[PDB]
Design a protein around this nucleic acid. Structure first.
Lengths: 120, 82, 48, 63, 176, 135
RNA sequence: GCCGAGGUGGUGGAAUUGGUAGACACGCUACCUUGAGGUGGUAGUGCCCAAUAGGGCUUACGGGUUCAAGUCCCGUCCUCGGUACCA
RNA sequence: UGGUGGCGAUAGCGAAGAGGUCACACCCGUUCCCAUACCGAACACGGAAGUUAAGCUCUUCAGCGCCGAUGGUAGUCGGGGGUUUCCCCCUGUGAGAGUAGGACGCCGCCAA
RNA sequence: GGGGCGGUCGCCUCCUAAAAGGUAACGGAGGCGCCCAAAGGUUCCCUCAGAAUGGUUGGAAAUCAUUCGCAGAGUGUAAAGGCACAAGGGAGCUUGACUGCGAGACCUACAAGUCGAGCAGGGACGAAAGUCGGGCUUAGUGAUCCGGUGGUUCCGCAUGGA
RNA sequence: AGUCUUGGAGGUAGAGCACUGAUUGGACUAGGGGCCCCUACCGGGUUACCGAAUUCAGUCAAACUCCGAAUGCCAAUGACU
């Protein structure tokens, strides 16, 4: 037969393991990461209010990149995360690597936000 | 006639440990005070309630106590302020 | 067999700690780094 | 692939005694084979020797 | 190299128009090949595990796992652990090379070879070759062989029903 | 000798006999049955004697349908022994019979034979019992 | 009645210290020695299916602990030894 | 559409359908980061040859699952009576089972 | 349920126990007087038991895939409670199986026993958020007196030591 | 302190089989026997001789709960007394 469950089903389980231990409180919004094959996405979420505050995707026709899956695409969408997080003033944020490792594009997002000034 | 039979084999028993609710719903409750003595988690900790090493439910802040429910068939202690 | 174990410091030589270990599963002299309040830091301790 | 664990792999030039050559990748650099698939008689349809041989005895009246 | 190109080019249009799929992705593909060893003489012969930790590294260079018994069995004189049997999993290019070794090179050397069974499909689309002699394809070297201990090969397609895995494995080259 | 093959606890409490039966109050496997008008403990031997009387009057029974089983054990201390020093050893097995419980049934046999068969069954039972047809 | 012990091949009987036998001394069997029996000497030896190979039943029994039970644990039957006292 | 949240499977399972330029994916390879007790299956790094088959959505449906009354009954607080291993009456309360029915999604946020 | 005889004496779990807690009997059942240097901590991973088939030696059952299995497994160990966001399984690194505490609670005649957010000193793991003051919770233990050992800006019978 | 109103914790009486144990019967059913046929215990030929697991229907439980009371308990809120 051999059948496989999706990347996304195990990804949501391993994300829900992460979500039991850190949340999007007041004055610590949750910095979530979604990591599609053709793009990458990053939101800044209140989990108490149910509201994402700022957002950034490589699906942005302004400030686009070529590769969109490169570490430079993740670095540019991370600097957009931190720039919108400074423009709408949360100023302190909690990094939700979302059911992934802290390895590649996700770590590129996180390092770009740490450089640009989001204090994890 | 006095015929000798003995040997019960079932005398002993342990000391009663006083599990259960120590505070109620709508009770004013200070910080650090034990809300529920249990073994296992018959009832879970919610907001401002911690689970101890001997899985006791205690209040983290001052405030009233509410026993709500965890959805399917499962309960919860939560402490709110005023 | 199970033995009561003191874990004396090395920088100070002071005892400061007790835990148990086997004489068979740990036949050698065991060592840990714990806190010496005379030394006020983490310090390598040693079974005595 | 883990390093220092697996043996090497070079392009095996598998031969055969019927002359048919074939290509894989193995530990051995070159392999000579005495009976391949196209040499073995089961792969070659209804074979010559054993199928021509395997007629059961026709109640051997002949003499 | 050659079995991937043979499979894609000749087989995938032919098998796709043999079973009339409504898309190219419904065509079954051989996903993995799992080579079991199953040497349980580790109890009475403690060294023997290294036999086919040696050999299955030579059968396919992916090193097998020294696999352990998951439950203690008194009738087999065996506690839980004391590892039993080796295991190779296989997907990539070496595996089509391995079926190239089996079909074109090895399975002639089965010294009593006839039609290997039609009746070795589980009902889901998967196949097993049961091997009893460990020297079939010429690397095994009679010189380095004393124990003849054979092998279990689990050829695992992605086929959902069974007879289309049949028509896959006939076209790959397995005789029946 | 109806006996449970295995029992968790060889010494159980004596329980209480109050309320009607939970179920089996009506005849549905057979055609004619016998209900209890009172509550009691019925042992192994009473079901033995009742079923034997049933089989002997019917002389070839269609079905006999024993609906009650002696699940509960009763223990008894030996003869001429003082109180205390442990609960006594188990002696017998009991079906607890609440009032309104169909004990035995009959199928395939005419009504008069069923009347007299359940009557000869009833004179082996400690309870007041009544005849019951299927509705 | 209560308490302690023990139930093993046809036999008396060890295994009771944790890893699978049913030791050892008798019978029993095949052969040898003798005119022939006895003693004596050699080789086997619980059982049933199997040429051997080889798998299972088996330590009074029935059930649990265990991956395993002759041993660890409980109940039934039996045989031992001690106790059954005070008016 | 895609991500992300709350709500008790009324969310489920199962069965049959429809969709791909975007989007999520399946996929194509491992040259580097990484990885696999084995292995690019997974995890990662890249890419965009085709693929709506699978996940995914989007329809339906009451077969299992789930929610679920009203009445009646069992039980029972208090008062009382009787042939008292139990039963009965009165006042109030009130199940469980079974049902009639509800249901194969409601609700926030952000980016397209 | 006279006394002797037998049996017991402390700690843990269930039932008794009557839907808070409590609750007796020579009432019904069981366990304990430990074990683990990983069987603790943290981080990242991930899912069990059985069954049906395809399978050498392989047997009813070792090892293999393959479906069905939101739980028949596991949780060091009785029993109960609890757990598949793991508390159950793996791997890396580790020693928080720390020191001084501790607002406030539970429990109780006392003696005791249990929980504890948070603070400081120093760390472990983690990128961080954070978590860590032993193990999944509850058994695994005993007062004082008297001695032994180790250390101390303590005393020391006139004074300095002892 | 009482009572009305409100919110809770706790799983007994009852009830039910959804776990765990017990257990009545029907339907099939691998398999175990018994009559045997020859015959390498090999292949079988039968049986109302027993049937593990599946399914339907019914029972029972202090140490069984998918469920769940009346009461009692803990409270807060006002209200009276």
């Amino acid at each position: 037969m051999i059948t496989k469950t999706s990347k996304n089903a195990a990804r949501l389980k391993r994300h829900a393991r992460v979500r039991a231990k850190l949340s999007g409180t007041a004055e610590r919004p949750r910095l979530n990461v979604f990591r599609s094959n053709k793009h990458i996405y990053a939101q800044i979420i209140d989990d108490v209010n149910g509201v994402t505050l700022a957002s950034a995707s490589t699906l942005d026709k302004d400030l686009n990149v070529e590769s969109t899956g490169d570490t430079s695409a993740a670095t540019k969408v991370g600097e957009l995360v931190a720039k919108r997080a400074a423009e709408k003033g949360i100023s302190d944020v909690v990094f939700d690597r979302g059911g992934y490792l802290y390895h590649g594009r996700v770590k590129a997002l996180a390092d770009a936000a740490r450089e640009a000034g989001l204090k994890f | 006639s006095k015929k000798g039979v003995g040997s019960t084999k079932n005398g002993r028993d342990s000391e009663a440990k006083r599990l259960g609710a120590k505070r109620a719903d709508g009770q004013f409750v200070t910080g650090g005070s034990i809300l529920y003595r249990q073994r296992g988690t018959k009832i879970y900790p919610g907001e401002n309630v911690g689970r101890g090493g001997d899985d006791t439910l205690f209040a983290k802040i001052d405030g009233t106590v509410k026993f709500e429910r965890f959805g399917r068939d499962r309960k919860k202690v939560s402490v709110y302020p005023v | 067999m199970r033995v009561n174990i003191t874990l004396a410091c090395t920088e100070c030589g002071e005892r400061n700690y007790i835990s148990k270990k086997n004489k068979r599963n740990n036949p050698d002299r065991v060592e840990f780094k714990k806190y010496c309040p005379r030394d006020k830091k983490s310090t390598l301790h040693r079974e005595t | 692939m883990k390093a220092g664990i697996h043996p090497n792999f070079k392009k095996a030039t598998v031969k055969c005694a019927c002359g048919n050559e074939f290509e894989t990748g193995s530990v051995k650099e070159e392999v000579r084979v005495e009976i391949c698939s196209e040499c073995h008689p089961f792969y070659t349809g209804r074979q010559k020797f054993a199928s021509a041989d395997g007629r059961v005895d026709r109640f051997n009246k002949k003499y | 190299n050659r079995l991937k190109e043979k499979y894609n080019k000749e087989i995938a249009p032919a098998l796709m128009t043999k079973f009339n799929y409504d898309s190219v992705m419904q065509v079954p593909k051989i996903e993995k090949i799992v080579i079991n060893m199953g040497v349980g003489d580790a109890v009475q012969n403690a060294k023997a595990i290294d036999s086919a930790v040696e050999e299955l590294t030579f059968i396919a260079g992916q090193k097998p796992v020294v696999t352990r018994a998951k439950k203690s069995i008194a009738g087999f004189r065996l506690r839980e652990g004391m590892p039993i049997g080796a295991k190779v999993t296989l997907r990539g290019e070496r595996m089509y090379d391995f079926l190239d070794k089996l079909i074109s090179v090895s399975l002639p050397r089965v010294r009593d070879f006839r039609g290997v069974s039609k009746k070795s499909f589980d009902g889901r689309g998967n196949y097993t070759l049961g091997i009893k002699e460990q020297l079939i394809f010429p690397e095994i070297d009679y010189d380095k062989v004393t124990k003849v201990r054979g092998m279990d090969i689990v050829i695992v397609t992605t086929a959902n029903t069974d007879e289309e895995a049949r028509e896959l494995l006939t076209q790959v080259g397995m005789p029946f | 000798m109806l006996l449970p093959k295995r029992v968790k606890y060889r010494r159980e409490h004596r329980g209480k006999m109050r309320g009607r039966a939970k179920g089996g109050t009506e005849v549905h496997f057979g055609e004619f049955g016998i209900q209890a008008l009172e509550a009691s403990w019925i042992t192994n031997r009473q079901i033995e004697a009742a079923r034997i009387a049933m089989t002997r009057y019917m002389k070839r029974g269609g079905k006999v349908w024993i609906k009650i089983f002696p699940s509960k054990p009763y223990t008894a201390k030996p003869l001429e022994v003082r109180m205390g020093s442990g609960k006594g050893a188990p002696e017998g097995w009991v079906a607890v019979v609440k009032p309104g419980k169909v004990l035995f049934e009959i199928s395939g046999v005419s009504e008069e034979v069923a009347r007299e068969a359940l009557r000869l069954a009833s004179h082996k039972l400690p309870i007041k019992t009544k005849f019951v047809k299927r509705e």
